[PDB]
PDB file of C-alpha atoms and ligand atoms in Angstrom:
ATOM      1  CA  UNK G   9     -23.108   2.984-197.276  1.00  0.00           C
ATOM      2  CA  UNK G  10     -20.696   1.083-199.473  1.00  0.00           C
ATOM      3  CA  UNK G  11     -20.284  -2.664-199.278  1.00  0.00           C
ATOM      4  CA  UNK G  12     -19.786  -5.779-201.379  1.00  0.00           C
ATOM      5  CA  UNK G  13     -23.308  -6.661-202.506  1.00  0.00           C
ATOM      6  CA  UNK G  14     -24.911  -6.305-205.909  1.00  0.00           C
ATOM      7  CA  UNK G  15     -26.354  -2.904-205.041  1.00  0.00           C
ATOM      8  CA  UNK G  16     -23.465  -1.267-203.151  1.00  0.00           C
ATOM      9  CA  UNK G  17     -20.394  -3.228-204.232  1.00  0.00           C
ATOM     10  CA  UNK G  18     -17.246  -2.550-206.264  1.00  0.00           C
ATOM     11  CA  UNK G  19     -19.105  -1.716-209.496  1.00  0.00           C
ATOM     12  CA  UNK G  20     -21.019   1.070-207.727  1.00  0.00           C
ATOM     13  CA  UNK G  21     -18.213   2.654-205.705  1.00  0.00           C
ATOM     14  CA  UNK G  22     -17.123   5.085-208.440  1.00  0.00           C
ATOM     15  CA  UNK G  23     -20.352   7.090-208.063  1.00  0.00           C
ATOM     16  CA  UNK G  24     -19.308   8.315-204.616  1.00  0.00           C
ATOM     17  CA  UNK G  25     -15.542   7.717-204.929  1.00  0.00           C
ATOM     18  CA  UNK G  26     -14.550   8.743-208.481  1.00  0.00           C
ATOM     19  CA  UNK G  27     -10.908   7.806-207.836  1.00  0.00           C
ATOM     20  CA  UNK G  28     -12.202   4.224-208.215  1.00  0.00           C
ATOM     21  CA  UNK G  29     -11.392   4.729-211.923  1.00  0.00           C
ATOM     22  CA  UNK G  30      -8.012   6.326-211.174  1.00  0.00           C
ATOM     23  CA  UNK G  31      -4.506   5.723-212.440  1.00  0.00           C
ATOM     24  CA  UNK G  32      -3.161   3.777-209.466  1.00  0.00           C
ATOM     25  CA  UNK G  33      -5.946   1.526-208.189  1.00  0.00           C
ATOM     26  CA  UNK G  34      -5.607  -1.742-206.288  1.00  0.00           C
ATOM     27  CA  UNK G  35      -5.717  -4.685-206.286  1.00  0.00           C
ATOM     28  CA  UNK G  36      -4.117  -5.823-209.546  1.00  0.00           C
ATOM     29  CA  UNK G  37      -3.285  -9.091-211.202  1.00  0.00           C
ATOM     30  CA  UNK G  38       0.386  -9.937-210.703  1.00  0.00           C
ATOM     31  CA  UNK G  39       1.738 -11.296-213.993  1.00  0.00           C
ATOM     32  CA  UNK G  40       4.694 -13.280-212.668  1.00  0.00           C
ATOM     33  CA  UNK G  41       6.441 -13.454-216.046  1.00  0.00           C
ATOM     34  CA  UNK G  42       6.319  -9.693-216.665  1.00  0.00           C
ATOM     35  CA  UNK G  43       7.339  -8.780-213.100  1.00  0.00           C
ATOM     36  CA  UNK G  44      11.024  -7.831-213.115  1.00  0.00           C
ATOM     37  CA  UNK G  45      13.705  -8.318-210.462  1.00  0.00           C
ATOM     38  CA  UNK G  46      14.694  -4.910-209.099  1.00  0.00           C
ATOM     39  CA  UNK G  47      18.264  -4.683-207.776  1.00  0.00           C
ATOM     40  CA  UNK G  48      17.550  -1.271-206.235  1.00  0.00           C
ATOM     41  CA  UNK G  49      15.276  -2.850-203.607  1.00  0.00           C
ATOM     42  CA  UNK G  50      16.917  -2.959-200.187  1.00  0.00           C
ATOM     43  CA  UNK G  51      16.443  -5.880-197.788  1.00  0.00           C
ATOM     44  CA  UNK G  52      12.925  -5.927-196.336  1.00  0.00           C
ATOM     45  CA  UNK G  53      12.680  -5.638-192.548  1.00  0.00           C
ATOM     46  CA  UNK G  54       9.533  -6.765-190.750  1.00  0.00           C
ATOM     47  CA  UNK G  55      10.122  -5.843-187.083  1.00  0.00           C
ATOM     48  CA  UNK G  56       7.118  -6.990-185.067  1.00  0.00           C
ATOM     49  CA  UNK G  57       8.856  -8.239-181.865  1.00  0.00           C
ATOM     50  CA  UNK G  58       7.422  -5.399-179.741  1.00  0.00           C
ATOM     51  CA  UNK G  59       3.957  -5.220-181.315  1.00  0.00           C
ATOM     52  CA  UNK G  60       1.118  -4.306-178.951  1.00  0.00           C
ATOM     53  CA  UNK G  61      -2.260  -5.512-180.155  1.00  0.00           C
ATOM     54  CA  UNK G  62      -5.262  -3.901-178.471  1.00  0.00           C
ATOM     55  CA  UNK G  63      -8.659  -4.824-179.841  1.00  0.00           C
ATOM     56  CA  UNK G  64     -10.537  -6.658-182.582  1.00  0.00           C
ATOM     57  CA  UNK G  65     -13.477  -4.910-184.281  1.00  0.00           C
ATOM     58  CA  UNK G  66     -16.158  -6.017-186.757  1.00  0.00           C
ATOM     59  CA  UNK G  67     -16.542  -2.858-188.862  1.00  0.00           C
ATOM     60  CA  UNK G  68     -19.284  -4.222-191.128  1.00  0.00           C
ATOM     61  CA  UNK G  69     -16.823  -4.889-193.966  1.00  0.00           C
ATOM     62  CA  UNK G  70     -14.201  -7.150-192.347  1.00  0.00           C
ATOM     63  CA  UNK G  71     -12.651  -7.409-188.886  1.00  0.00           C
ATOM     64  CA  UNK G  72      -9.648  -5.307-187.864  1.00  0.00           C
ATOM     65  CA  UNK G  73      -7.039  -6.276-185.281  1.00  0.00           C
ATOM     66  CA  UNK G  74      -5.805  -2.926-184.007  1.00  0.00           C
ATOM     67  CA  UNK G  75      -2.360  -2.064-182.629  1.00  0.00           C
ATOM     68  CA  UNK G  76      -0.962   0.648-180.388  1.00  0.00           C
ATOM     69  CA  UNK G  77       0.627   2.901-183.021  1.00  0.00           C
ATOM     70  CA  UNK G  78       1.461   5.718-180.601  1.00  0.00           C
ATOM     71  CA  UNK G  79       5.146   4.702-180.913  1.00  0.00           C
ATOM     72  CA  UNK G  80       7.341   2.584-183.208  1.00  0.00           C
ATOM     73  CA  UNK G  81       6.391  -0.703-181.537  1.00  0.00           C
ATOM     74  CA  UNK G  82       5.984  -2.680-184.776  1.00  0.00           C
ATOM     75  CA  UNK G  83       7.413  -1.379-188.021  1.00  0.00           C
ATOM     76  CA  UNK G  84       8.105  -2.208-191.638  1.00  0.00           C
ATOM     77  CA  UNK G  85      11.224  -0.815-193.339  1.00  0.00           C
ATOM     78  CA  UNK G  86      13.464  -1.574-196.271  1.00  0.00           C
ATOM     79  CA  UNK G  87      12.500  -3.086-199.582  1.00  0.00           C
ATOM     80  CA  UNK G  88      10.951  -0.326-201.706  1.00  0.00           C
ATOM     81  CA  UNK G  89      10.296   1.855-198.655  1.00  0.00           C
ATOM     82  CA  UNK G  90      11.936   5.169-197.771  1.00  0.00           C
ATOM     83  CA  UNK G  91      11.802   5.506-193.980  1.00  0.00           C
ATOM     84  CA  UNK G  92       9.765   3.819-191.260  1.00  0.00           C
ATOM     85  CA  UNK G  93       6.188   2.594-191.502  1.00  0.00           C
ATOM     86  CA  UNK G  94       4.270   1.801-188.318  1.00  0.00           C
ATOM     87  CA  UNK G  95       1.756  -1.049-188.033  1.00  0.00           C
ATOM     88  CA  UNK G  96      -1.757   0.204-187.241  1.00  0.00           C
ATOM     89  CA  UNK G  97      -4.022  -2.788-187.994  1.00  0.00           C
ATOM     90  CA  UNK G  98      -4.476  -5.967-189.943  1.00  0.00           C
ATOM     91  CA  UNK G  99      -7.550  -7.447-191.585  1.00  0.00           C
ATOM     92  CA  UNK G 100      -8.486 -10.046-194.203  1.00  0.00           C
ATOM     93  CA  UNK G 101     -10.547 -10.403-197.362  1.00  0.00           C
ATOM     94  CA  UNK G 102     -12.117 -13.780-198.076  1.00  0.00           C
ATOM     95  CA  UNK G 103     -14.595 -15.684-200.205  1.00  0.00           C
ATOM     96  CA  UNK G 104     -17.797 -17.679-199.901  1.00  0.00           C
ATOM     97  CA  UNK G 105     -15.830 -20.715-201.177  1.00  0.00           C
ATOM     98  CA  UNK G 106     -12.134 -21.591-201.264  1.00  0.00           C
ATOM     99  CA  UNK G 107     -11.765 -20.757-204.997  1.00  0.00           C
ATOM    100  CA  UNK G 108     -12.060 -16.995-204.456  1.00  0.00           C
ATOM    101  CA  UNK G 109     -11.442 -14.393-201.789  1.00  0.00           C
ATOM    102  CA  UNK G 110      -8.097 -12.771-202.526  1.00  0.00           C
ATOM    103  CA  UNK G 111      -7.882  -9.247-203.913  1.00  0.00           C
ATOM    104  CA  UNK G 112      -4.573  -9.569-205.695  1.00  0.00           C
ATOM    105  CA  UNK G 113      -4.302 -12.496-208.104  1.00  0.00           C
ATOM    106  CA  UNK G 114      -1.176 -14.298-209.332  1.00  0.00           C
ATOM    107  CA  UNK G 115      -1.287 -15.070-213.068  1.00  0.00           C
ATOM    108  CA  UNK G 116      -5.069 -14.641-212.627  1.00  0.00           C
ATOM    109  CA  UNK G 117      -5.242 -17.293-209.869  1.00  0.00           C
ATOM    110  CA  UNK G 118      -7.465 -16.344-206.927  1.00  0.00           C
ATOM    111  CA  UNK G 119      -6.547 -17.490-203.435  1.00  0.00           C
ATOM    112  CA  UNK G 120      -9.043 -18.314-200.674  1.00  0.00           C
ATOM    113  CA  UNK G 121      -8.216 -15.156-198.729  1.00  0.00           C
ATOM    114  CA  UNK G 122      -5.708 -12.331-198.344  1.00  0.00           C
ATOM    115  CA  UNK G 123      -4.240 -10.776-195.189  1.00  0.00           C
ATOM    116  CA  UNK G 124      -3.372  -7.055-195.182  1.00  0.00           C
ATOM    117  CA  UNK G 125      -1.017  -5.620-192.543  1.00  0.00           C
ATOM    118  CA  UNK G 126      -1.480  -1.848-192.782  1.00  0.00           C
ATOM    119  CA  UNK G 127       1.326   0.587-191.929  1.00  0.00           C
ATOM    120  CA  UNK G 128       1.679   4.368-192.109  1.00  0.00           C
ATOM    121  CA  UNK G 129       4.759   6.459-192.851  1.00  0.00           C
ATOM    122  CA  UNK G 130       5.899   8.052-189.610  1.00  0.00           C
ATOM    123  CA  UNK G 131       7.286  11.137-191.348  1.00  0.00           C
ATOM    124  CA  UNK G 132       3.653  12.290-191.644  1.00  0.00           C
ATOM    125  CA  UNK G 133       2.862  12.003-187.931  1.00  0.00           C
ATOM    126  CA  UNK G 134      -0.635  10.448-188.092  1.00  0.00           C
ATOM    127  CA  UNK G 135      -2.535   8.019-190.291  1.00  0.00           C
ATOM    128  CA  UNK G 136      -4.900  10.792-191.370  1.00  0.00           C
ATOM    129  CA  UNK G 137      -2.068  12.947-192.701  1.00  0.00           C
ATOM    130  CA  UNK G 138      -0.403   9.897-194.231  1.00  0.00           C
ATOM    131  CA  UNK G 139      -3.470   9.288-196.444  1.00  0.00           C
ATOM    132  CA  UNK G 140      -2.930  12.726-197.964  1.00  0.00           C
ATOM    133  CA  UNK G 141       0.474  11.625-199.295  1.00  0.00           C
ATOM    134  CA  UNK G 142       1.543   9.503-202.286  1.00  0.00           C
ATOM    135  CA  UNK G 143       3.854   7.467-200.034  1.00  0.00           C
ATOM    136  CA  UNK G 144       1.711   7.571-196.915  1.00  0.00           C
ATOM    137  CA  UNK G 145       0.977   3.861-196.469  1.00  0.00           C
ATOM    138  CA  UNK G 146       2.585   0.464-196.935  1.00  0.00           C
ATOM    139  CA  UNK G 147       0.430  -2.649-196.953  1.00  0.00           C
ATOM    140  CA  UNK G 148       2.016  -6.080-196.574  1.00  0.00           C
ATOM    141  CA  UNK G 149      -0.252  -8.565-198.343  1.00  0.00           C
ATOM    142  CA  UNK G 150      -0.171 -12.308-197.711  1.00  0.00           C
ATOM    143  CA  UNK G 151      -2.193 -14.915-199.557  1.00  0.00           C
ATOM    144  CA  UNK G 152      -4.068 -17.692-197.757  1.00  0.00           C
ATOM    145  CA  UNK G 153      -4.610 -21.146-199.244  1.00  0.00           C
ATOM    146  CA  UNK G 154      -6.574 -23.939-197.608  1.00  0.00           C
ATOM    147  CA  UNK G 155      -4.563 -26.894-196.331  1.00  0.00           C
ATOM    148  CA  UNK G 156      -2.964 -27.393-192.941  1.00  0.00           C
ATOM    149  CA  UNK G 157      -4.016 -25.163-190.052  1.00  0.00           C
ATOM    150  CA  UNK G 158      -2.073 -21.986-189.249  1.00  0.00           C
ATOM    151  CA  UNK G 159      -1.454 -22.175-185.475  1.00  0.00           C
ATOM    152  CA  UNK G 160      -0.832 -18.436-185.182  1.00  0.00           C
ATOM    153  CA  UNK G 161      -4.256 -17.693-186.668  1.00  0.00           C
ATOM    154  CA  UNK G 162      -6.263 -19.764-184.187  1.00  0.00           C
ATOM    155  CA  UNK G 163      -6.520 -17.038-181.525  1.00  0.00           C
ATOM    156  CA  UNK G 164      -8.140 -14.799-184.146  1.00  0.00           C
ATOM    157  CA  UNK G 165     -10.550 -17.538-185.237  1.00  0.00           C
ATOM    158  CA  UNK G 166     -11.628 -18.278-181.694  1.00  0.00           C
ATOM    159  CA  UNK G 167     -12.593 -14.681-180.835  1.00  0.00           C
ATOM    160  CA  UNK G 168     -14.811 -14.178-183.889  1.00  0.00           C
ATOM    161  CA  UNK G 169     -17.903 -15.585-182.142  1.00  0.00           C
ATOM    162  CA  UNK G 170     -17.720 -12.550-179.821  1.00  0.00           C
ATOM    163  CA  UNK G 171     -17.693  -9.986-182.664  1.00  0.00           C
ATOM    164  CA  UNK G 172     -20.267 -11.587-184.945  1.00  0.00           C
ATOM    165  CA  UNK G 173     -22.047  -8.384-185.987  1.00  0.00           C
ATOM    166  CA  UNK G 174     -21.130  -4.905-187.176  1.00  0.00           C
ATOM    167  CA  UNK G 175     -19.996  -2.597-184.416  1.00  0.00           C
ATOM    168  CA  UNK G 176     -18.951  -5.285-181.937  1.00  0.00           C
ATOM    169  CA  UNK G 177     -15.420  -5.302-180.545  1.00  0.00           C
ATOM    170  CA  UNK G 178     -13.424  -7.335-178.038  1.00  0.00           C
ATOM    171  CA  UNK G 179     -10.146  -7.012-176.186  1.00  0.00           C
ATOM    172  CA  UNK G 180      -7.362  -8.588-178.225  1.00  0.00           C
ATOM    173  CA  UNK G 181      -4.163  -7.917-176.302  1.00  0.00           C
ATOM    174  CA  UNK G 182      -0.953  -9.943-176.486  1.00  0.00           C
ATOM    175  CA  UNK G 183      -1.418 -11.209-180.035  1.00  0.00           C
ATOM    176  CA  UNK G 184       1.800 -11.755-182.001  1.00  0.00           C
ATOM    177  CA  UNK G 185       1.330 -11.002-185.727  1.00  0.00           C
ATOM    178  CA  UNK G 186       4.612 -12.770-186.534  1.00  0.00           C
ATOM    179  CA  UNK G 187       2.636 -15.996-186.421  1.00  0.00           C
ATOM    180  CA  UNK G 188       0.753 -14.974-189.574  1.00  0.00           C
ATOM    181  CA  UNK G 189       3.806 -14.781-191.859  1.00  0.00           C
ATOM    182  CA  UNK G 190       5.126 -17.458-194.235  1.00  0.00           C
ATOM    183  CA  UNK G 191       8.761 -18.571-194.080  1.00  0.00           C
ATOM    184  CA  UNK G 192       9.975 -16.551-197.075  1.00  0.00           C
ATOM    185  CA  UNK G 193       9.843 -12.783-197.467  1.00  0.00           C
ATOM    186  CA  UNK G 194      10.176 -12.898-201.266  1.00  0.00           C
ATOM    187  CA  UNK G 195       7.739 -10.299-202.618  1.00  0.00           C
ATOM    188  CA  UNK G 196       6.330  -8.266-205.455  1.00  0.00           C
ATOM    189  CA  UNK G 197       5.821  -4.513-205.089  1.00  0.00           C
ATOM    190  CA  UNK G 198       3.981  -1.774-206.950  1.00  0.00           C
ATOM    191  CA  UNK G 199       2.312   1.609-206.196  1.00  0.00           C
ATOM    192  CA  UNK G 200      -1.435   1.454-205.635  1.00  0.00           C
ATOM    193  CA  UNK G 201      -4.383   2.363-203.490  1.00  0.00           C
ATOM    194  CA  UNK G 202      -6.645   1.366-200.667  1.00  0.00           C
ATOM    195  CA  UNK G 203      -8.853  -1.470-201.941  1.00  0.00           C
ATOM    196  CA  UNK G 204     -11.836  -0.112-199.948  1.00  0.00           C
ATOM    197  CA  UNK G 205     -13.526   3.270-200.189  1.00  0.00           C
ATOM    198  CA  UNK G 206     -12.166   5.938-200.040  1.00  0.00           C
ATOM    199  CA  UNK G 207      -9.779   4.157-202.485  1.00  0.00           C
ATOM    200  CA  UNK G 208      -7.020   6.699-201.835  1.00  0.00           C
ATOM    201  CA  UNK G 209      -3.857   6.355-203.923  1.00  0.00           C
ATOM    202  CA  UNK G 210      -1.384   6.347-201.047  1.00  0.00           C
ATOM    203  CA  UNK G 211      -0.133   2.758-200.837  1.00  0.00           C
ATOM    204  CA  UNK G 212       3.134   1.017-201.567  1.00  0.00           C
ATOM    205  CA  UNK G 213       1.983  -2.586-201.914  1.00  0.00           C
ATOM    206  CA  UNK G 214       4.322  -5.391-200.835  1.00  0.00           C
ATOM    207  CA  UNK G 215       2.723  -8.757-201.694  1.00  0.00           C
ATOM    208  CA  UNK G 216       4.515 -11.875-200.465  1.00  0.00           C
ATOM    209  CA  UNK G 217       4.997 -14.660-202.996  1.00  0.00           C
ATOM    210  CA  UNK G 218       4.646 -17.555-200.528  1.00  0.00           C
ATOM    211  CA  UNK G 219       1.065 -18.109-199.300  1.00  0.00           C
ATOM    212  CA  UNK G 220       0.294 -19.246-195.789  1.00  0.00           C
ATOM    213  CA  UNK G 221      -1.814 -22.351-195.324  1.00  0.00           C
ATOM    214  CA  UNK G 222      -4.910 -22.220-193.123  1.00  0.00           C
ATOM    215  CA  UNK G 223      -7.348 -25.021-192.479  1.00  0.00           C
ATOM    216  CA  UNK G 224     -10.819 -25.271-193.958  1.00  0.00           C
ATOM    217  CA  UNK G 225     -12.200 -25.020-190.422  1.00  0.00           C
ATOM    218  CA  UNK G 226     -10.351 -21.731-189.856  1.00  0.00           C
ATOM    219  CA  UNK G 227     -11.687 -20.048-193.000  1.00  0.00           C
ATOM    220  CA  UNK G 228     -15.173 -21.465-192.402  1.00  0.00           C
ATOM    221  CA  UNK G 229     -15.240 -19.491-189.171  1.00  0.00           C
ATOM    222  CA  UNK G 230     -14.430 -16.259-191.041  1.00  0.00           C
ATOM    223  CA  UNK G 231     -17.531 -16.996-193.129  1.00  0.00           C
ATOM    224  CA  UNK G 232     -19.785 -17.106-190.022  1.00  0.00           C
ATOM    225  CA  UNK G 233     -19.273 -13.399-189.370  1.00  0.00           C
ATOM    226  CA  UNK G 234     -22.050 -10.973-190.325  1.00  0.00           C
ATOM    227  CA  UNK G 235     -22.021  -7.760-192.348  1.00  0.00           C
ATOM    228  CA  UNK G 236     -25.195  -6.695-190.519  1.00  0.00           C
ATOM    229  CA  UNK G 237     -25.613  -5.328-187.020  1.00  0.00           C
ATOM    230  CA  UNK G 238     -27.150  -7.113-184.060  1.00  0.00           C
ATOM    231  CA  UNK G 239     -30.880  -7.713-184.356  1.00  0.00           C
ATOM    232  CA  UNK G 240     -30.879  -7.238-188.146  1.00  0.00           C
ATOM    233  CA  UNK G 241     -31.396  -9.961-190.770  1.00  0.00           C
ATOM    234  CA  UNK G 242     -28.326 -12.116-191.200  1.00  0.00           C
ATOM    235  CA  UNK G 243     -26.038 -11.302-194.134  1.00  0.00           C
ATOM    236  CA  UNK G 244     -22.987 -13.529-193.985  1.00  0.00           C
ATOM    237  CA  UNK G 245     -19.671 -11.678-194.239  1.00  0.00           C
ATOM    238  CA  UNK G 246     -18.280 -13.385-197.351  1.00  0.00           C
ATOM    239  CA  UNK G 247     -16.819 -12.173-200.656  1.00  0.00           C
ATOM    240  CA  UNK G 248     -15.508  -8.937-199.136  1.00  0.00           C
ATOM    241  CA  UNK G 249     -12.911  -8.525-201.895  1.00  0.00           C
ATOM    242  CA  UNK G 250     -12.496  -6.038-204.729  1.00  0.00           C
ATOM    243  CA  UNK G 251     -11.528  -7.571-208.094  1.00  0.00           C
ATOM    244  CA  UNK G 252      -8.343  -6.722-209.938  1.00  0.00           C
ATOM    245  CA  UNK G 253      -8.161  -3.243-211.477  1.00  0.00           C
ATOM    246  CA  UNK G 254      -6.309  -1.982-214.568  1.00  0.00           C
ATOM    247  CA  UNK G 255      -2.523  -1.855-214.204  1.00  0.00           C
ATOM    248  CA  UNK G 256      -2.327   1.377-216.263  1.00  0.00           C
ATOM    249  CA  UNK G 257       1.177   2.970-216.293  1.00  0.00           C
ATOM    250  CA  UNK G 258       2.748   0.703-213.665  1.00  0.00           C
ATOM    251  CA  UNK G 259       5.342  -2.040-213.362  1.00  0.00           C
ATOM    252  CA  UNK G 260       5.451  -4.758-210.742  1.00  0.00           C
ATOM    253  CA  UNK G 261       8.922  -5.350-209.338  1.00  0.00           C
ATOM    254  CA  UNK G 262      10.181  -8.564-207.756  1.00  0.00           C
ATOM    255  CA  UNK G 263      12.564  -8.839-204.804  1.00  0.00           C
ATOM    256  CA  UNK G 264      13.918 -12.162-206.063  1.00  0.00           C
ATOM    257  CA  UNK G 265      15.918 -13.173-209.111  1.00  0.00           C
TER     258      UNK G 265
HETATM  259  C1  KGK V   1     -27.535   3.329-201.833  1.00  0.00           C
HETATM  260  C2  KGK V   1     -26.054   3.371-202.143  1.00  0.00           C
HETATM  261  C3  KGK V   1     -25.563   3.098-203.399  1.00  0.00           C
HETATM  262  F1  KGK V   1     -26.430   2.778-204.375  1.00  0.00           F
HETATM  263  C4  KGK V   1     -24.221   3.147-203.708  1.00  0.00           C
HETATM  264  F2  KGK V   1     -23.852   2.865-204.966  1.00  0.00           F
HETATM  265  C5  KGK V   1     -23.279   3.479-202.743  1.00  0.00           C
HETATM  266  S1  KGK V   1     -21.528   3.506-203.113  1.00  0.00           S
HETATM  267  N1  KGK V   1     -21.308   4.438-204.404  1.00  0.00           N
HETATM  268  O1  KGK V   1     -20.895   4.152-202.009  1.00  0.00           O
HETATM  269  O2  KGK V   1     -21.174   2.166-203.474  1.00  0.00           O
HETATM  270  C6  KGK V   1     -23.768   3.764-201.469  1.00  0.00           C
HETATM  271  F3  KGK V   1     -22.927   4.113-200.484  1.00  0.00           F
HETATM  272  C7  KGK V   1     -25.116   3.702-201.185  1.00  0.00           C
HETATM  273  F4  KGK V   1     -25.535   3.956-199.932  1.00  0.00           F
HETATM  274  C1  KGK V   2      -8.389   1.855-193.546  1.00  0.00           C
HETATM  275  C2  KGK V   2      -7.904   0.837-194.553  1.00  0.00           C
HETATM  276  C3  KGK V   2      -8.731  -0.183-194.999  1.00  0.00           C
HETATM  277  F1  KGK V   2      -9.986  -0.266-194.520  1.00  0.00           F
HETATM  278  C4  KGK V   2      -8.319  -1.117-195.920  1.00  0.00           C
HETATM  279  F2  KGK V   2      -9.186  -2.094-196.242  1.00  0.00           F
HETATM  280  C5  KGK V   2      -7.032  -1.059-196.462  1.00  0.00           C
HETATM  281  S1  KGK V   2      -6.422  -2.192-197.703  1.00  0.00           S
HETATM  282  N1  KGK V   2      -7.543  -3.246-198.079  1.00  0.00           N
HETATM  283  O1  KGK V   2      -6.120  -1.366-198.836  1.00  0.00           O
HETATM  284  O2  KGK V   2      -5.339  -2.882-197.047  1.00  0.00           O
HETATM  285  C6  KGK V   2      -6.183  -0.042-196.015  1.00  0.00           C
HETATM  286  F3  KGK V   2      -4.934   0.105-196.506  1.00  0.00           F
HETATM  287  C7  KGK V   2      -6.636   0.871-195.081  1.00  0.00           C
HETATM  288  F4  KGK V   2      -5.803   1.867-194.713  1.00  0.00           F
HETATM  289  O1  BGC V   3      14.706   2.286-219.913  1.00  0.00           O
HETATM  290  C1  BGC V   3      15.004   1.017-219.339  1.00  0.00           C
HETATM  291  C2  BGC V   3      14.258   0.844-218.035  1.00  0.00           C
HETATM  292  O2  BGC V   3      12.858   0.740-218.350  1.00  0.00           O
HETATM  293  C3  BGC V   3      12.022   0.727-217.196  1.00  0.00           C
HETATM  294  O3  BGC V   3      10.696   0.653-217.608  1.00  0.00           O
HETATM  295  C4  BGC V   3      12.361  -0.465-216.295  1.00  0.00           C
HETATM  296  O4  BGC V   3      11.642  -0.353-215.071  1.00  0.00           O
HETATM  297  C5  BGC V   3      13.851  -0.503-215.969  1.00  0.00           C
HETATM  298  O5  BGC V   3      14.185  -1.680-215.228  1.00  0.00           O
HETATM  299  C6  BGC V   3      14.689  -0.384-217.236  1.00  0.00           C
HETATM  300  O6  BGC V   3      16.072  -0.292-216.902  1.00  0.00           O
HETATM  301  O1  GLC V   4      -3.891 -12.630-178.083  1.00  0.00           O
HETATM  302  C1  GLC V   4      -5.256 -12.405-178.417  1.00  0.00           C
HETATM  303  C2  GLC V   4      -6.203 -13.066-177.440  1.00  0.00           C
HETATM  304  O2  GLC V   4      -6.016 -14.486-177.557  1.00  0.00           O
HETATM  305  C3  GLC V   4      -6.922 -15.233-176.755  1.00  0.00           C
HETATM  306  O3  GLC V   4      -8.225 -14.843-177.042  1.00  0.00           O
HETATM  307  C4  GLC V   4      -6.654 -14.935-175.292  1.00  0.00           C
HETATM  308  O4  GLC V   4      -7.579 -15.675-174.502  1.00  0.00           O
HETATM  309  C5  GLC V   4      -6.793 -13.440-175.027  1.00  0.00           C
HETATM  310  O5  GLC V   4      -6.389 -13.124-173.701  1.00  0.00           O
HETATM  311  C6  GLC V   4      -5.947 -12.632-176.002  1.00  0.00           C
HETATM  312  O6  GLC V   4      -6.290 -11.259-175.898  1.00  0.00           O
HETATM  313 ZN1   ZN V   5      -7.479  -4.975-197.208  1.00  0.00          ZN
END
């Protein structure tokens, strides 16, 4: 199966997922000087007050915190979005060292990690139908830099020892994803894709400008996870990021003047 190593990583994915070389791939470098303020963007609304987290899963690529998306409990609206997008899961991408790990870059600068809150457009009824649509998904991306600890991340950090290997899961109820946001909702937006196989071109990306700060100890615990299953030789789960892809016929728009 696909992964992030030399023999199954991003440079190999196109052989089984030809859209990897498509017209709308993610991530991209965000050139902050070329990005243009867009007055047509509406105010962004992140409404997570009623979110219901359920479970945390090591899927052999990253870990996903899953939400009850059987109703509009936690939604993203506004900004570039037409309609309501329901939160289904979040996960991260991170590096083996603090100088890399993010998928998007900002004027080519790589952050230590990147958080993705994944939402699907409710007009399509289920995530599976949504990923057959050009506007099926919205991913809210948040950069992580290493500095002071992020208190709202610590519950995630502390459960990782129980999901060390691929296929392990644990209860993860009553987690509030609002604690993972920065203060400002200033953002850049562009049309793109999943950054993992199957690389489907369904995503409106909304990437926040303000990083969150996490401590070195927090990110070091991400790096103790394993790509491998239980019993198998240890392969540390690090560098699970795809590099920036060609911008092609796209423009990045900014929410801020
Ligand atoms: C043995 C092997 C590969 F060489 C490979 F390139 C990929 S791919 N294109 O998905 O990255 C695989 F899934 C795989 F199992
Ligand atoms: C199922 C799934 C992923 F595994 C994933 F990694 C992403 S990503 N990195 O583009 O945020 C998604 F949007 C997504 F829907
Ligand atoms: O033709 C002018 C238009 O060009 C487009 O590429 C830009 O996105 C618009 O902001 C601009 O008004
Ligand atoms: O909120 C996520 C999780 O945080 C801590 O692990 C709590 O002990 C647990 O009860 C909860 O599910
Ligand atoms: Zn992701």
